[PDB]
Symmetry: C2
Subunit: 165 residues, 2 copies
């Protein structure tokens, strides 16, 4: 039984396989994927060596409380912004024992879209203790709630791999 599609499962595999000999651990912070990024990473046998913790923070209160996202960041730029994603990744990294953190915030739909922030808009950020930061703004389109969530999982994993090189 494999829950995730093969690209996601392979990317998760590569991360566990790569990170273990390097002694590297990961933390996740999720606000649209609902735990699926941690879920995908932990599908892999041996993932206990690598996965530290995950923060599932749909609510803006949870983003502030669990990850230290600023109240004014949220009120000025919204939950779904570059600024929020960066602060989420910073919080997930420093509030964990991980070497790398990836954070995502987006609109999976069907609800919650607008001209300015459409369904499928997702901001992703990854940060390393060495200081390296990567951010991408993705606009997946109105392609379905599960579809956007899985698209986001794949991008998050790709970013962890990239960060590591």
């Amino acid at each position: 039984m494999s829950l995730f599609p093969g690209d996601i499962e392979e990317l998760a595999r590569r991360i566990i396989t790569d990170f273990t000999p390097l002694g590297l651990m990961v933390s996740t912070a999720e606000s649209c994927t609902g735990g699926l990024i941690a879920g995908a990473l932990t599908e892999i046998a041996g993932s206990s060596a690598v996965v530290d913790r995950g923060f599932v923070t749909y609510t803006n209160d949870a983003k502030r409380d669990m990850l230290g996202v600023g109240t004014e960041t949220l009120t000025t730029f919204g939950a779904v912004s570059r600024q929020t994603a960066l602060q989420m990744a910073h919080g997930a990294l420093y509030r964990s024992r991980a070497n790398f953190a990836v954070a995502v915030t987006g609109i999976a739909g069907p609800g919650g879209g607008s001209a300015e922030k459409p369904v499928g808009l997702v901001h992703l950020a990854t940060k390393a203790r060495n200081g390296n930061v990567l951010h991408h703004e993705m606009r997946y389109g109105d392609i379905g709630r599960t579809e956007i969530r899985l698209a986001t999982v794949r991008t998050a994993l790709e970013m962890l791999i990239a960060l590591n090189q």
Copy 2:
């Protein structure tokens, strides 16, 4: 598009459907399922009304920091125990705005099994603000890592429903 087994999706849908008019929210604390319980609940449109937050406490450090599980519970009873499950549920509840928390700690395998704590052993606990707690020890068997994880998600969702019925 489906991601989880139909019956798991049905259970998640029941929780979102029931809890919304009741104004109730849930938090999850996950070791062995790695976020799939929150994942399953948030497959449902409208789940944002109900799902407050989730803790994936894959390590013992995480159980301690995020949930306040005691070092004393962990070295005496183990990460996989009724006691750890109860403390996780309590921690997830009172470190959130939820009405109910569900916590799971188990051995998905393939590794880590022993006679006393075999692969497929999972402790689940749900707690409500009024103090009501439910706990189940499951022994799903050595049936595969994804299989045990999904079996755990199912039971976790069943228990949230039961805990609500009892309130």
